[PDB]
Amino acid sequence: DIVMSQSPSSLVVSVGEKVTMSCXXXXXXXXXXXXXXXXXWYQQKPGQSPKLLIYXXXXXXXGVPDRFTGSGSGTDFTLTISSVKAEDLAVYYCXXXXXXXXXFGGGTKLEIKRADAAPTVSIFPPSSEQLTSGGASVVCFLNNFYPKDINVKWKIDGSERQNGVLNSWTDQDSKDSTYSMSSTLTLTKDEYERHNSYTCEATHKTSTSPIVKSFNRNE
Amino acid sequence: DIQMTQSPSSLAVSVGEKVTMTCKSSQSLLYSSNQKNYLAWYQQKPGQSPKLLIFWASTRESGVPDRFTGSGSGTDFPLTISSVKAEDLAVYFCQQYTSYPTFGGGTKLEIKRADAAPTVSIFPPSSEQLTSGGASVVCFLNNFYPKDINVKWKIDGSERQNGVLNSWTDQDSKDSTYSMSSTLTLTKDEYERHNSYTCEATHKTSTSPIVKSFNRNE
Amino acid sequence: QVQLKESGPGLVAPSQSLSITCTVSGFPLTXXXXXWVRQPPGKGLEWLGXXXXXXXXXXXXXXXXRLSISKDNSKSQVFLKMNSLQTDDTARYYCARXXXXXXXXXXWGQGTSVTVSSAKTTPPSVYPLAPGSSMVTLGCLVKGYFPEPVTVTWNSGSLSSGVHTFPAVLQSDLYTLSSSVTVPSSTWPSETVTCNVAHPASSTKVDKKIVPRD
Amino acid sequence: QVKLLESGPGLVQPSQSLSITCTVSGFSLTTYGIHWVRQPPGKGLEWLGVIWSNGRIDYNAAFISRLSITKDNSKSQVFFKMNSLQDDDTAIYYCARNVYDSLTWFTYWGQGTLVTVSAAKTTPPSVYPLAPGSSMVTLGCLVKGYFPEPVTVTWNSGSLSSGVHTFPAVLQSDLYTLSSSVTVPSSTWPSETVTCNVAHPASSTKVDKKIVPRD
Amino acid sequence: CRELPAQKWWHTGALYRIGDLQAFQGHGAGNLAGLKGRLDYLSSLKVKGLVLGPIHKNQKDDVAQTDLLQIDPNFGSKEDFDSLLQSAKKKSIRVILDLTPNYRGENSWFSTQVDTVATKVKDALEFWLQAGVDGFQVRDIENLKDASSFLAEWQNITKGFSEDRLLIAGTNSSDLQQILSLLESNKDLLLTSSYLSDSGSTGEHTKSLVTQYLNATGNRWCSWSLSQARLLTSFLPAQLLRLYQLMLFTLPGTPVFSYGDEIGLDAAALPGQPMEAPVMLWDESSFPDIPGAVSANMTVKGQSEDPGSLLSLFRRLSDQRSKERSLLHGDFHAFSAGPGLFSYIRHWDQNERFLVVLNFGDVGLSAGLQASDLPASASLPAKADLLLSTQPGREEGSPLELERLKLEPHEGLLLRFPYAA
Ligand SMILES: *[C@@H]1O[C@H](CO)[C@@H](O[C@@H]2O[C@H](CO)[C@@H](O)[C@H](O)[C@H]2NC(C)=O)[C@H](O)[C@H]1NC(C)=O
Ligand SMILES: *[C@@H]1O[C@H](CO)[C@@H](O)[C@H](O)[C@H]1NC(C)=O
Ligand SMILES: *[C@@H]1O[C@H](CO)[C@@H](O)[C@H](O)[C@H]1NC(C)=O
Ligand SMILES: *[C@@H]1O[C@H](CO)[C@@H](O)[C@H](O)[C@H]1NC(C)=O
């Protein structure tokens, strides 16, 4: 059967920097009886189905913005975009089209290069509805920052809490090309109520100062 | 699909002499089962749509004088003119038969000539136009050969540059001269704010500016 | 237009068989060929088969012994019957149409997930989030659920721009997630802000409006 | 004999339709093909599709079905229909004819039709007399304020043609404006009445202006 | 066991249609006597007959001067024609004539005063049958009013003088309730229509369109053609042109081509040629109006030397049509198969059996042969020795197992397996 390999795994590309990726096939996909080529590119934004872009290696589908001009022939092909837009972060598969067990490609990750922005940290206390249950969990969002590599740290009454940490990154954003992250520290009823101050610390790449929003139980 | 690269963009040759207009293409034009090569040439006189000159790369159409004949075989071929006349000033075409997408481009013929001092004529605006609020004094510069000439408008002895549109003509079929209009555009208020309006000629054939002017009180 | 509705995601116990539905519209089904693919998240995409207008299947050789593609021509829906549901069948299946005998999968469906473990279907527990002491953000915490898909939409789609739903993370047989939406300060004590927890595979929809703190 | 004349509208707006009818006067269509060949002015020629004697219709490779040329032997009219025009297709469109079966273009219509595509309105021009103020004495004549180029100006309706010159029109303020000059013998000018005759077909305004010698 | 049903002369091979004789053999020589060097060429394709274009004298739309009994003198003379008929039996190739009176007007039957036209052609049958020619052809009988009542006596007289003649009718309406409403009592005539014309965008209806026709016909003898007077390539892509002469030959019926389609002649991408009648390209001197649109491989003298052509296929598929017995008059069984293809069998008890599998898709489908329905007198063996493949790249002579077959995209097959039972 045909082997579909995908050469670039991830891509940082600035706004308007001519995305170019490639995919390699096992045998030729250029049948020398119709003298055409058979490959196909699929685009999937996070949370959606994939979408058809190119069929027979050179055509554009109905209803496509024409920044996408894929090319190549033989055992290697190239998807070439002229310039990216705000909504082009997706995954891009290649496909065999002329075979029996139509094997898709591996996948790639396109992310956009952008300037460095700082979070807006907000920590919220557990509601009385959860404290009705005897449960407690403190929530600390981190919104709209471009550096992916980040450090969250927690402290209880100033004393550092290292355990109980649940992390949640998100995808890159569709508009400002930023990431996001929450942090939930879930504790029991009285282990919450045996301590007063709770400290959520955001250690980021954009600044040396940890933006630390914090609160106390009696506050 | 064949493309027809004609070699000269233009050619300047005085009367009685011989020129070569060639064209180059991709493919062999000789259909090998015959011995002919499929080809044409066209003559576009200015203002008119063209007519035939030559079919089948070496013939004449009926009613065309034999100063022109075509030669060449295969891919590269000239026209040649055995002597050039005064009326033969035109644009020459290479056009195609062999594949079905047919055409090529057009070259230009120009001609060398004895130089000519121009004839300058000025015209003040009318009772009809200045009634309609617009002021445009115009000047005519007829009958000169050497193509680059500079008209100079002046208002009260001072050089005026703005408000003037220029327009040349083509080289004439009979005497091979040129003719040029310069159209000053201003307001009737600025028109009546002066007396002297001056038309000056900067030409090659001498260095004296052949002047035409009039005062508005006249 | 090409519109392809599905069941959304469902849950069955392992080593079983189930009907995964794909109700289509906007075109007569006999004029095209509906196909299905398989994707587990964080992995590649895999194709398994294709039915046709004459109820004829040409299945793939890899997933051959454990598929069963069929069709209902009358109700404009292509079914699928999995069987012997093992661990790593937890994945996504898209019912994707294509041009007839061309294999150009253009119109895809919304896709469905499938889960096979013997844990129970449980309704989620909801917690609104009121801030501490301009542009401010609000949240809506949901914990304790294991039917997998949840879409939460604020005020029935009234606020839509600055919403970032965070992904669901599993711990102790239950998933949880966090909502996030940045609303100007003039709106929250004055307007309607109601987190609406729509849970399809529990068939439950709960709305929670955030009252201010004390 | 072999005589052509065609009927074009002159100017249509961007992204609109067109209809050129070449009424072949003198010879029957059913043995000679009819092409169409366009020319943006000052530039090269570019092919448009033919209609053969049968009814077989061709087009160019650059556009297969943008064009639609229909032949009708009812009144010897050859219809032309192009759709989705732009300002990059302002050109001379003219009729043509082949030598019997191959592509030697035997004639063309010698005039043609100059069609340009813009959003501006065709305005009727304004003619202005030019007699000199203060041998051989040169006269001229202005016409002013018109959008389509076809305007032509003749002197005593083509009586003198040798000593005359006519200048091309220049676009300014959405208005083309030309003049035409003529060397006039001094035995004629205050004695023979000079008649400037302006003809604009797109405005369909044929007005004649006798040139008065000045005061 | 089995006593053989009798073989007439036109089940045993192919027809051939020529519309414009002046367009066939090239310009200038538009004579009937000219096409006698070409009859050596038509015995290379070994067709078992041809219908010749309408040569009766016919002023366009004129009733009083339109006579079916003498040759229009553009084509030669009457005594030229008896040299044609006599020389044609040197190669055992029959001749059939058109008998539509109008063929230069639009309506080919003079819709006003219908019965005098039929009265004219009724006498015209007798003279040409005494002239020694064998077979006629009428086109656009739906333009003729009440065509079934007139189809009787024209069939009756051409069965009268002998029973080795032929009478081909034609129509355009592709609805089955019109088509077999002609063959309901009139059974001993061939018919060609536009029934297989409307392909559903590269052949999606075709596997139903053969089978529904071949079932509703009650398994008589019929005739397989795309249309009554037009070429193959004026309906199809040029990529399907090797997957219909495979189907049009091994079906149970009379193959009715036109001229030039053994090249796959393209009426499009040839300017100056009409839609009804291009010129046939014997070599490069066949079209000197333009040297460009004529390539090297669009000619007979391009394809006669390459074995991977369309013509070189057509010189090895008609040869199998007239020769082997099961493709002559055998029985047709189309078993069920995969999603987007079409396949069948032909068997004749102890003779060779021929297995056909086509591929109307556009992908590299693997052939799922899901038969299970045949009699055990003719069912699938393990291997078949691969007679013919429309696209080069395989053996043509190797035994291949059936359930691991792996068709190429747009490739049909010819598989020959013996009795072995
Ligand atoms: C199929 O044949 C029918 C029957 O002749 C055609 O329809 C007629 O066309 C003629 C043309 O002159 C008209 O006068 C008739 O009025 C039409 N109708 C009938 C009921 O006779 C039809 O055009 C043909 N269609 C095709 C695709 O070949
Ligand atoms: C026409 O056919 C019928 C049916 O066989 C037959 O009875 C009749 O005699 C035939 N007509 C003539 C003139 O023989
Ligand atoms: C032919 O088809 C019809 C309907 O498709 C069916 O009823 C009939 O039985 C078929 N003929 C035979 C001989 O099976
Ligand atoms: C003949 O070969 C040429 C390539 O030289 C190709 O373009 C053309 O399509 C071929 N003819 C046909 C009928 O396919």
Q: Rounded to an integer, what distance in angstroms lies between the CA atom of residue A22 and that of residue A70?
A: 10
Q: Rounded to an integer, what distance in angstroms lies between the CA atom of residue D79 and that of residue E340?
A: 45
CA distances from A110 to A44, A81, B24, C60 (A): 11, 12, 49, 30
* Residue A199 host element (H or E): strand A197-203
At residue E134's C-alpha, the angle toward residues E132 and E139, to 5°, is 130
**Which residue(s) pair with C97 in the sheet?**
C34
Partner-chain contact D56 E275, CB within 8 Å: yes
Task: Confirm if B193 and B216 have CB atoms less than 8 A apart.
Answer: no
CATH class of B4-110: mainly beta
Give the CATH number of domain E21-323.
Answer: 3.20.20.80
Cα E215 to averaged position of ligand 3 atoms, centre (Å): 6
Report, in angstroms and rounded to the nearest whole number, the Rg of chain E calculated over CA atoms. 22
Half-sphere exposure of B182 (CA within 13 A, CB side): 23
Half-sphere exposure of E25 (CA within 13 A, CB side): 20
- Laid out side by side, the sheet with A71-73 consists of A4-6, A20-25, A76-80, A71-73
Are residues D134 and D98 located together in one domain of the fold? no
Half-sphere exposure of E129 (CA within 13 A, CB side): 22
What tokens appear for C19 in the block? Answer: 């009907």
A203: three-class secondary structure by DSSP: strand
Q: Rounded to an integer, what distance in angstroms lies between the CA atom of residue E264 and that of residue E244?
A: 11
Count other Cβ atoms within 10 Å, centred on residue C112. 20
Count other Cβ atoms within 10 Å, centred on residue E113. 9
E272 touches chain D (CB under 8 A): yes
Q: Which of C85, C116, C147 is the last residue of a domain?
A: C116
Partner-chain contact B49 D110, CB within 8 Å: yes
Angular region, E92: left φ>0, alpha ψ -120 to 50, beta rest = left
| Three-state SS annotation for C104-141 | CCCCCCCCEEEEECCCCCCCCEEEEECCCCCEEEEEEE
Query: What length is written for chain C?
Result: 214
Are residues C138 and C170 located together in one domain of the fold? yes
Task: Confirm if B103 and B3 have CB atoms less than 8 A apart.
Answer: no
At residue D206's C-alpha, the angle toward residues D201 and D207, to 5°, is 145
Partner-chain contact E363 A102, CB within 8 Å: yes
* Residue C151 host element (H or E): strand C151-152
Report, in angstroms and rounded to the nearest whole number, the Rg of chain B calculated over CA atoms. 24
Ligand 1, CB cutoff 6 Å, lining residues: E 106-107, 142-143, 172-173
E386: three-class secondary structure by DSSP: coil
Q: Rounded to an integer, what distance in angstroms lies between the CA atom of residue E44 and that of residue E317?
A: 12
- What's CA A165's distance to the chain center, in Å? 21
Residue found under tokens 């039917």: C147
Are residues D111 and D24 located together in one domain of the fold? yes
Q: Rounded to an integer, what distance in angstroms lies between the CA atom of residue D142 and that of residue D129?
A: 6
For A44, residues 6+ apart whose C-beta sits below 8 A from its C-beta are A50, A51, A90, A91, A93
Q: How far is B90 from chain E (nearest CA, A)?
A: 29
CA distances from C33 to C30, C54, C78, C100, E145 (A): 7, 10, 10, 6, 44
| Three-state SS annotation for chain D | CCECCEECCCEECCCCCCCEEEECECCCHHHCCEEEEEECCCCCCEEEEEECCCCCECCCCCCCCCEEEEEECCCCEEEEEECCCCHHHCEEEEEEEECCCCCCEEEECCCCEEEEECCCCCCCCEEEEECCCCCEEEEEEEEEEECCCCCEEEECCCCCCCCEEECCCEEECCEEEEEEEEEEECCCCCCCCEEEEEEECCCCEEEEEEECCCC
Task: Confirm if E407 and E366 have CB atoms less than 8 A apart.
Answer: yes
What tokens appear for E10 in the block? Answer: 């036109």
The per-residue DSSP string of E387-415 comes to -EESSSSS-SS--EESSS--PPTT--EEE
Burial D19-47 (b: 16+ CB within 10 A, else e): ebbbebeeeebeebbbbbbbbeeeeebeb
Nearest to C101 among E336, E360, E366 (CB): E360
Burial D55-85 (b: 16+ CB within 10 A, else e): ebebbbeeeeeebebebeeeebbbebebeeb
Q: Rounded to an integer, what distance in angstroms lies between the CA atom of residue B51 and that of residue D58?
A: 23
Structural domain boundaries of chain A?
4-112, 122-216
Burial A95-122 (b: 16+ CB within 10 A, else e): bbbbbbbbbbbbbbebbbeeeebbbbbb
Question: Taking Cα atoms as reference points, which of A216, A204, A202 lies closest to residue A138?
Answer: A216
Structural domain boundaries of chain E?
21-323, 331-421
Nearest to E361 among C54, C57, C101 (CB): C101
Give the CATH number of domain B119-215.
Answer: 2.60.40.10
The answer to the question of residue D1 being in a domain is no
Question: Taking Cα atoms as reference points, which of C25, C22, C19 lies closest to residue C6?
Answer: C22
Cα E144 to averaged position of ligand 2 atoms, centre (Å): 22
Q: Rounded to an integer, what distance in angstroms lies between the CA atom of residue C72 and that of residue C146?
A: 31
Angular region, B28: left φ>0, alpha ψ -120 to 50, beta rest = beta
Q: Rounded to an integer, what distance in angstroms lies between the CA atom of residue D153 and that of residue D199?
A: 6
DSSP 8-state symbol, E33: G
Amino acid D133 reads G
CA distances from E20 to E53, E57, E93 (A): 6, 14, 19
Count other Cβ atoms within 10 Å, centred on residue A18. 12
Q: Rounded to an integer, what distance in angstroms lies between the CA atom of residue E395 and that of residue A187?
A: 74
Q: For helices E114-130 and E147-160, what crossing angle results, to 10°? A: 20
Are residues C18 and C103 located together in one domain of the fold? yes
Are residues D204 and D156 located together in one domain of the fold? yes
Domain region containing D151: 126-211
Is D90 buried (19+), middle (13-18) or exposed (0-12) by CB count in 10 A? middle
For C49, phi then psi, to 5°, come to: -175, 180
Q: Rounded to an integer, what distance in angstroms lies between the CA atom of residue E221 and that of residue C172?
A: 75
Please list every residue in chain C followed by a chain break, i.e. its C lies more than 2.5 Å from the next written N: 133
CATH of the domain at D102: 2.60.40.10
What tokens appear for D111 in the block? Answer: 């005039």
Q: Which of D96, D117, D138 is the last residue of a domain?
A: D117
At residue E345's C-alpha, the angle toward residues E343 and E348, to 5°, is 170
Question: Taking Cα atoms as reference points, which of C191, C164, C193, C196 lies closest to residue C180?
Answer: C164
Q: Rounded to an integer, what distance in angstroms lies between the CA atom of residue D140 and that of residue E335?
A: 92
Partner-chain contact A98 E362, CB within 8 Å: yes
Q: Rounded to an integer, what distance in angstroms lies between the CA atom of residue B54 and that of residue B65?
A: 11
For the range C52-61, what are the long-range contacts, defined as Cβ-Cβ under 8 Å and sequence gap of 24 or more?
C52/E339, C52/E340, C53/C29, C54/E339, C56/E336, C56/E338, C56/E339, C57/E339, C58/A100, C58/E338, C58/E339, C58/E365, C58/E366, C58/E368, C60/A100, C60/A101, C61/A101
Q: How far is B8 from chain E (nearest CA, A)?
A: 27
Task: Confirm if C72 and C90 have CB atoms less than 8 A apart.
Answer: no
Write out chain A residues lying below 8 Å of C176, CB-based: 166, 184
The per-residue DSSP string of B56-106 comes to TTS---TT--TTEEE--BTTEEEEEESS--STT--EEEEEE-SSSS----E
Query: What length is written for chain D?
Result: 215
For E417, phi then psi, to 5°, come to: -130, 145
Which overall architecture, per CATH, does domain A4-112 show?
A: Sandwich (2.60)
What tokens appear for B34 in the block? Answer: 């015959």
Experimental method: cryo-EM
B216: three-class secondary structure by DSSP: coil
CA distances from C179 to A182, C47, E137, E315 (A): 9, 34, 80, 74
Q: Rounded to an integer, what distance in angstroms lies between the CA atom of residue B156 and that of residue B84?
A: 48
Amino acid A105 reads G
Question: Taking Cα atoms as reference points, which of E136, E138, E185 lies closest to residue E158?
Answer: E136
Partner-chain contact B55 D104, CB within 8 Å: yes
How many structural domains is chain D composed of? 2
Question: Taking Cα atoms as reference points, which of C112, C118, C95, C200 lies closest to residue C153?
Answer: C200
At residue E371's C-alpha, the angle toward residues E369 and E374, to 5°, is 145
Task: Confirm if A122 and C137 have CB atoms less than 8 A apart.
Answer: yes
The data reach a resolution, in angstroms, of 4.1
For E84, phi then psi, to 5°, come to: -75, -50
Residue found under tokens 């028109």: B191
Question: Does A contact D via 3+ CB–CB distances below 8 Å?
Answer: no
Extended beta strands in E114-234, E state? 136-137, 167-170, 191-192, 222-224
List D residues 125-144 in contact with B (Cβ-Cβ < 8 A). 126, 128-134, 138, 140, 142, 144
Partner-chain contact A31 E406, CB within 8 Å: no
How are beta strands B76-81 and E136-137 bridged, if at all?
Answer: unpaired
Report, in angstroms and rounded to the nearest whole number, the Rg of chain D calculated over CA atoms. 21
Topology agreement, domain A4-112 and domain A122-216: yes
Angular region, E406: left φ>0, alpha ψ -120 to 50, beta rest = left
Write out chain C residues lying below 8 Å of A123, CB-based: 132
Partner-chain contact E290 B97, CB within 8 Å: yes
Task: Confirm if B149 and B201 have CB atoms less than 8 A apart.
Answer: yes
Q: Rounded to an integer, what distance in angstroms lies between the CA atom of residue A90 and that of residue A108?
A: 8
Are residues D71 and D33 located together in one domain of the fold? yes
* Residue E22 host element (H or E): helix E21-24
Q: Rounded to an integer, what distance in angstroms lies between the CA atom of residue E46 and that of residue E93?
A: 8
DSSP 8-state symbol, B157: T
B140: three-class secondary structure by DSSP: strand
Q: Rounded to an integer, what distance in angstroms lies between the CA atom of residue E193 and that of residue E142?
A: 11
Q: Rounded to an integer, what distance in angstroms lies between the CA atom of residue C39 and that of residue E11?
A: 56
A26 touches chain C (CB under 8 A): no
**Which residue(s) pair with C114 in the sheet?**
C10, C91
CA distances from E294 to A136, B38, B100, D104, E266 (A): 85, 15, 10, 19, 10
CATH class of A122-216: mainly beta
Give the CATH number of domain E331-421.
Answer: 2.60.40.1180
E363 touches chain C (CB under 8 A): yes
The answer to the question of residue D187 being in a domain is yes
How are beta strands A76-80 and C33-39 bridged, if at all?
Answer: unpaired
What tokens appear for C59 in the block? Answer: 């299945």
What tokens appear for E350 in the block? Answer: 């102890």
Residues D93, D95, D98, D101: is their CA dihedral positive or negative? Answer: positive
CA distances from C43 to A8, E9, E166 (A): 16, 66, 68
For E51, residues 6+ apart whose C-beta sits below 8 A from its C-beta are E15, E16, E17, E18, E95, E96, E97, E98, E135, E137, E168
What tokens appear for B152 in the block? Answer: 């100079």
Task: Confirm if C59 and C110 have CB atoms less than 8 A apart.
Answer: no
Residue found under tokens 């030229």: E80
Amino acid A147 reads P
What tokens appear for E127 in the block? Answer: 């003279």
A5: three-class secondary structure by DSSP: strand
* Residue E153 host element (H or E): helix E147-160
Question: Taking Cα atoms as reference points, which of E145, E154, E147 lies closest to residue E99?
Answer: E154
Give percent helix, percent strand, percent coil of chain A, each to the nearest 5.
5, 45, 50
For E246, phi then psi, to 5°, come to: -70, -40
What tokens appear for E192 in the block? Answer: 């060609």
What tokens appear for E189 in the block? Answer: 């005539």
Are residues D205 and D103 located together in one domain of the fold? no
CA distances from A138 to A120, A196, D170, E172, E288 (A): 17, 13, 77, 80, 89
What tokens appear for E341 in the block? Answer: 């293809």
> Which of E239, E261, E295, E312 is the pocket-test mutation for ligand 4 (most atoms within 8 Å of CB)?
E295
Q: Rounded to an integer, what distance in angstroms lies between the CA atom of residue C98 and that of residue C31?
A: 10
